[model samples]
Target: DYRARLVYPFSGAISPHADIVDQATLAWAAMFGLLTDSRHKSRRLQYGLLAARAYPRADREMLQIAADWIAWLFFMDDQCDETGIGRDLQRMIALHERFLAILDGATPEAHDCALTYALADLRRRLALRAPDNWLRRFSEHVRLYFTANRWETVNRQRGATPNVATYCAARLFSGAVYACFDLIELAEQIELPFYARHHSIVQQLEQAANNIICWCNDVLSYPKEMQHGDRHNLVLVIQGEHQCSLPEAIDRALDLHAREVATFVRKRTCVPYFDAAVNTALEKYVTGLQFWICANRDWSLTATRYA
Candidate 1:
């Protein structure tokens, strides 16, 4: 019956490729299942599985790249501070290395341009061993993932995506890093009034980012995410106006921007007090985070209003 459904043709369809059409149909079905599934935390698993199945004869290098990316995604998911996110990432990374070894052994020619380039970039960034650099990479990935998922479109339209699980994973990855940084900095500066002020700022920024992330999920997934899955789904709560009020939303957004400015203060006083040369780098790093939060917030707000 499913095969028949996939095979069915449109009245005016021309140059129809049954295999391609069937693959598309199946892919859509799998994505739908992932979005609606109660147990799945991340949709990368479903997406990767569907991709692997669809292209059984795909090149080894290409397949490995897909596998690696998906595995990396899972690793990131597992890196969440709570719920043993780190363990998940470690396990996925181990599995990925195994696959990489297989590909390396099978063929000396098994290398992809994009994969190689990305890996090299990651290596360079990691080798620098700077927290600021890591933060920049985090910001870059957030922007790229948001753009790729057409998150702006969904925000504007107030609709759900077939690929929502993957999108959510990206959001979680970005948000977690932001939250972790805030907590870490707060811990470092807990004693001094100057440092304490920055803690408030970090809190505000975290709340704002968290609000947007929750708002998007609620608007898009609605009642479905509330009833069927984890409590992280805030769609129903927001709609009820019980969990999130308009005034609260506005305050959170504004406070996030205000809090982001604290990073500048930290750079001027904290970094320079320790080392003057570090001031320039600290200023640049904090300025970048501030800019990223501003840009990301604007994009999200514009999308929300338009959608």
Candidate 2:
């Protein structure tokens, strides 16, 4: 993230619950066929690392739920991403409508899809832990994630790669970075009120955070994307648009990440004076965002799935 450019960066710590997190991750993988190649054994795929890194402050009781959520997301993202479902806009729309219905509490027409069942279980869990408003927020981000994937697919069908800047702009929404941001506040139980939530400074902080998160993700995942021929990544897009070598394109990606970091640090430092309550709420909000940017690089490095 922004720290890649900083002299004294804040490092994220992991939750001291590895054994418990791993057990839960293994169970979720078994449930969802995440470890299709290694069904009978556990492996180092970094799901546990992500769970611990992103929620180091979470209670022991909450780690199981958090691990499940993390595991489900990585699992689902792998299973269906670029599975050719996004080429037909209407079909993608229909598919997302099914997802929307599931998020809205309607039973899926069929239970064959692991995602449908997984999300239904997530809904029940969210209901127990979050407000209706928060659940709505979470569902909207998940919905957009699918929509964004389709956008990429549609462009691909046309033999187009968006400008890196354009890709990053949409990447924030499509990458499901927002959903994880929402979960940060939720997982921490730090509710951001309306005024604090919509403040321009908060929005910038969020934008910068999203930029850092997505670009950092693209950079770290570049090697894997290359292996899979996933050229939609902004890194390769940068390479083509600028006619640059992979190393040069990687440099450009890191430059973008550095600027996003600077933007985050500057805006976060300049948050205007507000009342004590708003200040308190926004402080928690910024801190939660900080949590994500700090650990993303580390988690990416640890994840064997991207190897």
Candidate 3:
């Protein structure tokens, strides 16, 4: 009975390459044996759309890689949440430890599971497309993602609802939004100079976009999360913190999202100057972030993932 009232000020599009890339990624995942059962098969294709919408500017080959990586992420999420590992602290930590090793260029064991195989393949493809700097940044974000999941596992094990501030910080990494931002360079083939990439305003704008994407997901997925007794959702967190009803918390979550989108709009125009080439790359990178915000909101609404 709930509906999203969230509004994003940026325009989003589905990549023209979506249909082709979707088919290829799904086939690739199946070849890797990543789709385990009927439910996994049914839900995995919906994930490919998020990559297309978020990286609409990517060419066919890049979009295909993006879709495959997005599918792998969702596969890992399902492994953690639906496979009962999300509540097992030791097991979750060990799982991420193995994953970090794979991400660090270790080859998967010969009998490794589908998840391990898929990640090994993904890292190889990404290494081919991304430069050394981009790969380093991506590896750091992936580590953040791995570390953040431990926090969620601890909270779930203790049956605790995190306070808003701590939830916001962990959710930024746990949501895997930052890692996708690193994908923008590969998708668009534009790498910003380190100075421009790490500039205060650019960082702020990226933070805002990341918040918008994660919060929008929280609002849209609240019902499914509630059914599963997951207290990590932002709407549920807001309700507990503010002592408000469900509807009120939903509104509050949307308010936070709307205001962050406004902040992104303002800060995007104030980016520091680099030379012509870097400036153009910055513009493309920021546009990719905009696409991420709008595409995540729109795809979450229309996709059957939460239903």
Alpha-carbon local distance difference test for all models: 0.35, 0.74, 0.84
lDDT of 3 by residue, 1-307 (tens): 3454577655788888777777787788879998775655464457678888999988887788788888888888876666588989998877777888998899998767788788888889888888777878998998898888888888888999999998998899998888999889888888677788888988898899999888888988888888888878889999999999998999888889888988999998898677889999999999999999888877787877876
Two-way TM-score contest, 1 vs 2, winner: 2
Scored by Cα lDDT, where does model 3 land?
0.84
State each candidate's clash count.
8, 1, 0
Show where candidate 1 strays beyond 4 Å: 1-272, 302-306
Q: Of 1 and 3, which scores higher on lDDT?
A: 3
For model 1, the local distance difference test gives 0.35
- Between prediction 2 and prediction 3, the one with superior TM-score is 3
Name the runs in model 2 displaced over 4 angstroms.
1-8, 32-34, 38-42, 82-91, 109-111
> Candidate 2 vs. truth: CA RMSD?
2.8
In model 2, what lDDT does residue 112 have?
Answer: 42
TM-score of each: 0.30, 0.89, 0.95
Writing each residue's lDDT as its tens digit, candidate 2 over 1-307 gives: 4225422156777888866787777877678555665333356665776777777787765666767777777765664453565455666666667778888898755544666677777778777888888888888888888778778767756767788778877888877878878877666777777777778888889888888877778876777767655676778989989998888888888887787887888888888777887788778778878877776777776666655
**Model 3 misplaced regions, further than 4 Å:** 1-4, 39-44
Query: Best-fitting candidate, measured by TM-score?
Result: 3
Best by lDDT: 3
